[PDB]
Design a protein around this ligand. Structure first.
Ligand code: NA
Ligand code: NA
Ligand code: NA
Ligand code: NA
Ligand code: NA
Ligand code: NA
Ligand code: NA
Ligand code: NA
Ligand code: NA
Ligand code: NA
Ligand code: NA
Ligand code: NA
Ligand code: NA
Ligand code: NA
Ligand code: NA
Ligand code: NA
Ligand code: NA
Ligand code: NA
Ligand SMILES: [Zn+2]
Ligand SMILES: [Zn+2]
Ligand SMILES: [Zn+2]
Ligand SMILES: [Zn+2]
Ligand SMILES: [Zn+2]
Ligand SMILES: [Zn+2]
Ligand SMILES: [Zn+2]
Ligand SMILES: [Zn+2]
Ligand SMILES: [Zn+2]
Ligand SMILES: [Zn+2]
Ligand SMILES: [Zn+2]
Ligand SMILES: [Zn+2]
Ligand SMILES: [Zn+2]
Ligand SMILES: [Zn+2]
Ligand SMILES: [Zn+2]
Ligand SMILES: [Zn+2]
Ligand SMILES: [Zn+2]
Ligand SMILES: [Zn+2]
Ligand SMILES: [Zn+2]
Ligand SMILES: [Zn+2]
Ligand SMILES: [Zn+2]
Ligand SMILES: [Zn+2]
Ligand SMILES: [Zn+2]
Ligand SMILES: [Zn+2]
Ligand SMILES: [Zn+2]
Ligand SMILES: [Zn+2]
Ligand SMILES: [Zn+2]
Ligand SMILES: [Zn+2]
Ligand SMILES: [Zn+2]
Ligand SMILES: [Zn+2]
Ligand SMILES: [Zn+2]
Ligand SMILES: [Zn+2]
Ligand SMILES: [Zn+2]
Ligand SMILES: [Zn+2]
Ligand SMILES: [Zn+2]
Ligand SMILES: [Zn+2]
Ligand SMILES: [Zn+2]
Ligand SMILES: [Zn+2]
Ligand SMILES: [Zn+2]
Ligand SMILES: [Zn+2]
Ligand SMILES: [Zn+2]
Ligand SMILES: [Zn+2]
Ligand SMILES: [Zn+2]
Ligand SMILES: [Zn+2]
Ligand SMILES: [Zn+2]
Ligand SMILES: [Zn+2]
Ligand SMILES: [Zn+2]
Ligand SMILES: [Zn+2]
Ligand SMILES: [Zn+2]
Ligand SMILES: [Zn+2]
Ligand SMILES: [Zn+2]
Ligand SMILES: [Zn+2]
Ligand SMILES: [Zn+2]
Lengths: 172, 172, 172, 172, 172, 172
């Protein structure tokens, strides 16, 4: 037992390790998306920048979870970071839709984590999740939904002009 | 075939994808090391900072390789990032020794990549490797060797005082 | 023999004179393109600016090659600069495609020059080419490929609106 | 017919295309002279700088003529830029004498152009020539004549000391 | 074996030790030249300054080679620094000619070193030489050739006025 | 005889040439020591910096002696700079002890030089030595003695921790 451990359940520790892996996976997915939009036959630089920023933010989230694990006296156990489900993301709209789905999956995992923390009477972990993750997820999901709405209304993905102008005026 | 591709061999493209995976793996190893030194029962904050900086640098190297792949008209294919070989790195000296071994492995891969680029008459790729990777690897290996030498001479890992003072005076 | 000449093969000297002519020719092609887009019945000012900048850059490349020739003790022999293959470049997309083809031709000449320098064991010339020309060519080719991709996706050349908006938002 | 064309004779358009070629040729001659003085066995850096500046100025004159052609609704037709009559310019004094002869030839062409514009009742073209070319030519010819006079009086080309000191004190 | 040594051939290590000695020797030669021009019966202060600067630059080159030797895990073995071949350098022109010969000898040694590094498949050493030594040697040789040309054309060494004015206007 | 020579004995001139060689030799010894401490298996960066600074100071002393030789109308005659007696200096303490011995040898040579100048009634040379060398030697010897004392009291060379902490706190 760690000398700092107090009111930290082994189930919570395991769930935090799983969340660390999920955040690293999301970072990897966003990295793949960014460099898809960096291809010469796609060439949407602001889509690339947007998804690279998301990748770095997901890495920061994972590192905050590892810091939490150490603060509470749990032990970090890392697992393989699985490759993203796609090599080719097919369009700005498709990438935004996949990102929306990914963020909702991460949010579901965070909500299950909060439910576990509540069931284990761990208010510090509950507040950690609330303060650093839940509203960030809600804001990200709302922004991605807005982006999907606008791309669809402008006529993406069929309209390369739509994706070009969205890249310039919303993401630039 | 990509409209930008010129004098870029499929073997070189494959080798670059392998190097991308290796750099991401090295980033993951350094991340694990950093948060090992963040544990309450290790508590060497400057070891943690040193290895976190290395992790971020390895990520930047991987992203530079992906950018190169797109610049030359190759296609990025990502693979799983395997978990590090250790969860517990046992000491500052042991972590520095493992980092030295890892950097020499990465350097060997880069040298094989340069040999392939030379054999394929790809001077742009040769110079890319020389400019951005080879001397960085040599400098990193020399620095890690210096750190290992100093820790051993001060009496690590048996001397917790040795690791404490090295953390303060060399890494701080 | 020049008092400064050392390890400089006559074949390399001839190849450098040929490269000087090729760079001057590329400068002339870009000049023609720029002032095509300055016509009242074309009127794409940022296409004109882009190609004029390319023309001046090609002139600078030619002058750097002449400076190299003198540094190594070779002798500059200038030839006629042939007129560009077109007087009318037909569209922004067509001009970008022709520029991509031209840059790939120049890159091929530079790669043959590097192969000659390698065969003659002239590492100074090899590094001169690597440092000042090869990555510039790769970057130019990637940028032109990106431009061609975006123009095609926006609907050029049939879409005068596509070329207008590309002129404003990418080249402006 | 161009929508902007007004009071612009086809003879004037042809003469302007010829002048564009002549200015580009003069630029090329000055480029050759500059890098002759950059040779290790000539080594007069301020002669080299002087003639390189002249080369760039001639390019600017050519581009101003192309801009004029488009402003008036004429169409630019480029021709080969012939190589300079010399590879070796033999001395600072000889190069200055050749430059004087070249500038007087360009001035003669400009005066014939002005006579044509007057005969065609094209006051805009007349004033364009007067404003941007005629006094520039007179000033250049006077300066080159001054340089030739001083070099001859100092004892060039027989006096390498004369050319050295002129390079330092007049052109530096 | 050094813990940092990787892909570093014993032949390359020996060649680097020889190059260190050669650079120190060149530094000594330039020191001798500088203080020859500091003599009361020579009294060319800017020749003295020029050669002293060259001496210090050669020392810096030697120290960079020693740093490289340690970076790669080789071991420095110093040898005697032989005295320069002359005590009296006879004139500014003669000293410049001897310096040109010395720089071409150093360049030949560096080119042989690069050939050895290429034969041993040591791209880090190849790029080290290319980046830090080859173009510096080419530039130094071109500058010395220019100086020799100008001194000869001004009438050195017979013209003490020639050497005086060169000292003032080129080296001052 | 030099036109500036006055009250300058040939014995003094010879002794000054010998002192020039001795100072250059001391510079070389300190250079060797510095790069010994730059080795990956020694890795004491502030020892390396200290001895490199000493090497540069010894070079400056040698150049001041050559300047003196020319000021007095003597003639500089350079000799080989012998290699240092050691390639491996074994420890910070051993290097400091060798440096102390070297500085006392140089001081003895300077004192013999002053005795010669006194015997030859050369007060300018006497004061030159007093002003620029004697107290510098005394200060250097006292500082090296202090360093040796502290290293011995801290437990060097057996205590790698002693040398590490001395490197950090006294030489850093
Ligand atoms: Na767990
Ligand atoms: Na689990
Ligand atoms: Na915490
Ligand atoms: Na591949
Ligand atoms: Na592979
Ligand atoms: Na690239
Ligand atoms: Na030739
Ligand atoms: Na040819
Ligand atoms: Na050069
Ligand atoms: Na015409
Ligand atoms: Na005509
Ligand atoms: Na106009
Ligand atoms: Na050796
Ligand atoms: Na040897
Ligand atoms: Na190195
Ligand atoms: Na003597
Ligand atoms: Na003697
Ligand atoms: Na004096
Ligand atoms: Zn514990
Ligand atoms: Zn659980
Ligand atoms: Zn691409
Ligand atoms: Zn792109
Ligand atoms: Zn964009
Ligand atoms: Zn997240
Ligand atoms: Zn998988
Ligand atoms: Zn696709
Ligand atoms: Zn709350
Ligand atoms: Zn493609
Ligand atoms: Zn391969
Ligand atoms: Zn902990
Ligand atoms: Zn801690
Ligand atoms: Zn700390
Ligand atoms: Zn790396
Ligand atoms: Zn695994
Ligand atoms: Zn442990
Ligand atoms: Zn010549
Ligand atoms: Zn050839
Ligand atoms: Zn027009
Ligand atoms: Zn227009
Ligand atoms: Zn515009
Ligand atoms: Zn070019
Ligand atoms: Zn033609
Ligand atoms: Zn048209
Ligand atoms: Zn718009
Ligand atoms: Zn028209
Ligand atoms: Zn006409
Ligand atoms: Zn030359
Ligand atoms: Zn020159
Ligand atoms: Zn000059
Ligand atoms: Zn003109
Ligand atoms: Zn011709
Ligand atoms: Zn000539
Ligand atoms: Zn060793
Ligand atoms: Zn060898
Ligand atoms: Zn004197
Ligand atoms: Zn003097
Ligand atoms: Zn002077
Ligand atoms: Zn050198
Ligand atoms: Zn000797
Ligand atoms: Zn003499
Ligand atoms: Zn290179
Ligand atoms: Zn004068
Ligand atoms: Zn004398
Ligand atoms: Zn004596
Ligand atoms: Zn070493
Ligand atoms: Zn070291
Ligand atoms: Zn240190
Ligand atoms: Zn001294
Ligand atoms: Zn010896
Ligand atoms: Zn040792
Ligand atoms: Zn006194």
């Amino acid at each position: 037992t760690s000398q700092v451990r107090q009111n930290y359940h082994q189930d919570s520790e395991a769930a935090i390790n799983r969340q660390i892996n999920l955040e690293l996976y999301a970072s990897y997915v966003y990295l793949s998306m960014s460099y898809y939009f960096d291809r010469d036959d796609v060439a949407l630089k602001n889509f690339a920048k947007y998804f690279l920023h998301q990748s770095h933010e997901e890495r920061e989230h994972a590192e905050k979870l590892m810091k939490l694990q150490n603060q509470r006296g749990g032990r970090i156990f890392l697992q393989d970071i699985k490759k993203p489900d796609c090599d080719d993301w097919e369009s700005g709209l498709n990438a935004m839709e996949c990102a929306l789905h990914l963020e909702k999956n991460v949010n579901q995992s965070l909500l299950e984590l909060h439910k576990l923390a509540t069931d284990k009477n761990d208010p510090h972990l509950c507040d950690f999740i609330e303060t650093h993750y839940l509203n960030e997820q809600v804001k990200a999901i709302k922004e991605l939904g807005d982006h999907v709405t606008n791309l669809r209304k402008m006529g993406a993905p069929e309209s390369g002009l739509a994706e070009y102008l969205f890249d310039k005026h919303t993401l630039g």
